[PDB]
Amino acid sequence: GKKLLEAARAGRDDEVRILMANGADVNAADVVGWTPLHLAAYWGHLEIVEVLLKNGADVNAYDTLGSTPLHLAAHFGHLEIVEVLLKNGADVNAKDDNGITPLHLAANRGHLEIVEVLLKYGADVNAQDKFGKTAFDISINNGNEDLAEILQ
Amino acid sequence: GSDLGKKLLEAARAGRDDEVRILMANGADVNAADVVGWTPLHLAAYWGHLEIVEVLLKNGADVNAYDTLGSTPLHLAAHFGHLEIVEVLLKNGADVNAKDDNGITPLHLAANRGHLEIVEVLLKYGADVNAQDKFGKTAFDISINNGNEDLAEILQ
Amino acid sequence: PGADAKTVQDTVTQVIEQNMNGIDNLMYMSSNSDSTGTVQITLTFESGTDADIAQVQVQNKLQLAMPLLPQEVQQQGVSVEKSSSSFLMVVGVINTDGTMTQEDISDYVAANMKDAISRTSGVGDVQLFGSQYAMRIWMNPNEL
Amino acid sequence: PGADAKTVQDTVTQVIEQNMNGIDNLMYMSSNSDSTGTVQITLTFESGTDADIAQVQVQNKLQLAMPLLPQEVQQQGVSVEKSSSSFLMVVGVINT
Amino acid sequence: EDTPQFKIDIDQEKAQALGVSINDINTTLGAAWGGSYVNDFIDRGRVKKVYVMSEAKYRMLPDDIGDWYVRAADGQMVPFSAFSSSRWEYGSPRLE
Amino acid sequence: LGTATGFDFELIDQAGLGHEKLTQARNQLLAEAAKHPDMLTSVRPNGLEDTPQFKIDIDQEKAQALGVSINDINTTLGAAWGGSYVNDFIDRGRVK
Amino acid sequence: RYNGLPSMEILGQAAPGKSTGEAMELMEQLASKLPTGVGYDWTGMSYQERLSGNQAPSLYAISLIVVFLCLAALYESWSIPFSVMLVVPLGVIGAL
Amino acid sequence: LPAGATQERTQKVLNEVTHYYLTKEKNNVESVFAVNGFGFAGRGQNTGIAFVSLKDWADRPGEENKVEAITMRATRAFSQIKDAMVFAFNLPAIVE
Amino acid sequence: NKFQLTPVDVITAIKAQNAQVAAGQLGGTPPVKGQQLNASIIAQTRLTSTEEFGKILLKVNQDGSRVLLRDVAKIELGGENYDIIAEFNGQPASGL
Amino acid sequence: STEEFGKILLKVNQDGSRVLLRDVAKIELGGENYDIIAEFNGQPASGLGIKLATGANALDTAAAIRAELAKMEPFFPSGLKIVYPYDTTPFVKISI
């Protein structure tokens, strides 16, 4: 499992199936609660996200602060991974311990295509975080006029 | 200021016993005081020269001489933890409850430095345990403020 | 103290580096900024460079950067040394009666031995393997 | 200004002394701190040492200890000088 | 190699609203979790440092963050969880 | 070159003894030197002897209770009695 | 302070008829009986005196040897140099 | 060790290294001075160094008892320590 | 003037919101023995773009409305100074 | 001392009771940092890692280090002993 967490982070897509062929825990978690799916999402390893899901990896696994792989892919602008995760049933409205949603994170970093896909899969635009801010509030604050209009 | 008076202030401070002996035979003022009002007894007490304390006391030293801020030799001896000097001064009539200009007593000073035996000696000679300095503090207050449990127990 | 690598780099390393110019015989410059809060900038000179002058020139530029450094960095002391990178020797200190802890020995060494070894001619740098004592105030958030 | 000897020693003299490292050809160092608010630290070097290098090495170690000194001492400044030099003459200026 | 780091965002607006200064917030976070060199003292005649820091048991776990309080202008104790949010990310422990 | 007569001797506090204990040790050595007039003459300190000084204790509690800050107290005492270098002015074109 | 430690400087000289080196050796002996943790060191003239005194013999011998070698070359003889070298006391006695 | 590793885990690896020298190189190594938290890299939790001293050359007869053979064996033994990079090396003739 | 702000308020907000904070560690030394996690705490970092400087918060109104830096100023990359302008054969240029 | 630091008066409650520093913190003498821990053959140690100044003679600097240590040893606390775990110097002298 530790080898899988490492293989996942490195993008060694080959090593990943070899270990899973030897039955490594697909939901193996590291010290901050990140699974192999968390790490692939983070470093943009599409192939490994795909292989992990097909081997029953928990698509809604969360880390010790409530953040999910969809949070990570959305925040870091990995469009394809966001799509894959949503297809495999990722909670589009998942909240981390701060009440921050994938939509919040995508909005904050101006990931327009990602916001659209999230909206498509039914992300709640009214969702507030712990400070009562929505994706819309963020767009206005950031001066993103493109995004601000998409949130209408 | 005396010729021999000054010599005596120095000898007592330095604990030059034999010199003090000669000075006594010659009539050196035991009541000599420097600018801040310290006598040889003050000096001997401060620096802890026991024999000189005894010699000075045999020779008519004021046991209760106070300096310009009202401190006595018992204050100094208590404060710097010279137990045997404390005992000697008390036996020779030192005011166990002498207050300096700050309302500070020998018990205050000894407690503040954690000198348990001296505190005991002073209590034995009738140190007023309830005496307060200019700030309303007792030796007991000092003890618990200093976090000295043993001392506190002593003063109840 | 307490700084991550990026904070060290962007607040100290980069500032000092940008002040390293007009230094004679410089072949190259390298640095590390780590999450210990530590930065080390190494300037390497052509063979035959007077090491005294090299140090003087490096510090003349460093003092232009000093006021631009965070106060907490200035107060830890910045230093400039001219040494070999490898150790000449390690002087070890133990207690054979086992009546002193590691912490104890380290404070003793730091407090009584290290300065005079540091002032000895030929001694470029001294690393203490341990720490000098400090007054440690360990705060409790509940009581606070 | 206005400092007793112990104040000078414990906030100025010791700090500077602890920073006098990595200086070449030093024989010994000595200091006094007094109640006129003054400290002097003399470093004496091996015969044959270049006095200029010695001074600049001392002053550069000092320069890096300045942030550790009290404000008012930084304000007054701290001088580094060759002191083993003597007077050619002394010109007195009086008013009669 | 990069490692996990604990990223915490101070919400400027929330802080302003509660009347807790950002300086208090940063000193509070930094002193507790990082340690702060306050000033010097004398230990057996040698000048040495004074460090303030959280006791170990209160700076080991991420949830500990919210156990620290800052005093607002109105004198109310405000926990870190009221004006901040955090997330895991990766960063470098040694930048070259 | 300086005096260059007799010897120049340094007595050193090698542990944590402190000023008073080092004075006692000095006095001890000076007394023993004096017992050998046949070999040693004029063995004496080059420095100064302790003198009366005026210790004033600020009571923190009473100050806090009166609403008097320590900085004000200490700056009042030191500026008034010790004097304080505020800043510079220009006197006929020279900074002073 | 001396070499970073609390210190006290002591001056003195050798009694009439005695050498300073002898007076130093006694001072070292009395010094060895001082309370635990009190050390000492020689500085200034005494520092110069010591390291200067350890050369003299080697320098006088080198002089002696070279004078003899020159004379032996001059006279083509290992023994005749002696007849010249014997004159040294003849002038030195007058000086004394 | 990898960044993120604790001082405790670094100590564990250090013990294995110290152990190896104390038991498997009894004939060759005189002493081990091991340091947790210091490496060439920098004062980290995840780093350490061991300074090894060997018995005199005369007591280490043969190529198998010289530093090159000792460090190969050591580095191979340590190759099996998990999640740490550990290796012994002879410093080159001239480092540089 | 319209928001009752001054350059002093603007400077304060930039110092506060364009900060790079040392924030310490989770599981840093000395730890509670048994600690698995050691991670840097990352708090404020320097702003990197005109957009970030623009959304610096100067104040919220009585009304809850926000006043950002872009509401009282233009934000853009531009020279530290605008004193030097060079041309090469009449064409805009820079140089060393 | 820890005692003096403990009785630092943080504040006086309205009921007059005192809040002392020892009430919100543990006070102890402890390291400036807690990152570097050393052993010598498995027992507690400290030490000095010494690097040679640029161009300085290794054999000469080592001798000078030895002479300085010799001055310290007579004043050690009981049980304290210098050990010599790693020296590059003997090999220079010996091989020559």
Author numbering:
A (entry chain E): 15 to 166
B (entry chain D): 11 to 166
C (entry chain A): 50 to 193
D (entry chain B): 50 to 145
E (entry chain A): 722 to 817
F (entry chain B): 674 to 769
G (entry chain B): 818 to 913
H (entry chain A): 578 to 673
Sentences from the paper on this structure:
The AcrA-AcrB-TolC complex is a secondary active antiport system in Escherichia coli, powered by the electrochemical proton gradient across the inner membrane of this Gram-negative bacterium. Its biological function is to capture cytotoxic compounds from either the periplasmic space or the inner membrane, and to expel them across the outer membrane, into the extracellular medium. AcrB is the inner-membrane component of the system, and is responsible for both substrate recognition and energy transduction. The asymmetric trimer structures indicate that this domain also cycles between three distinct conformations, and point to several ionizable residues in its core (D407, D408, K940 and R971) that might function as a proton-relay network.
To further assess the proposed proton-relay mechanism and its influence on the conformation of the TM domain, we solved the atomic structures of four AcrB variants, namely K940A, R971A, D407N and D408N, all of which abolish the drug-efflux activity of AcrB. Electrostatic calculations for the R971A and D407N crystal structures indicate that, like K940A and D408N, these variants lack the ability to bind and release two protons. In D407N, like in D408N, only one proton is loaded (on D408), and only in the O state. The R971A and D407N substitutions, however, not only perturb the energetics of the conformational cycle and the transduction of the proton electrochemical gradient, but also seem to preclude the protomers from adopting all the native-like conformations, particularly the T state. The effect of the D407N substitution is subtler than that of R971A, but also underscores the relationship between the local configuration of the proton-relay network and the organization of the transmembrane repeats. The D407N structure shows that although the substituted asparagine can accept a hydrogen-bond from K940 in the L and T states, its orientation is geometrically inconsistent with the second hydrogen-bond with T978 seen in the wildtype. In the L state this appears to be compensated by an alternative hydrogen-bond donated by N941, but this interaction is not feasible in the T state. In addition, the asparagine substitution removes the attractive electrostatic interaction between D407 with R971. In sum, the interaction network at the R1-R2 interface is partially disengaged. Consequently, the T state in the D407N structure shows R1 and R2 partially displaced, in a conformation that is again intermediate between the wildtype T and O states.
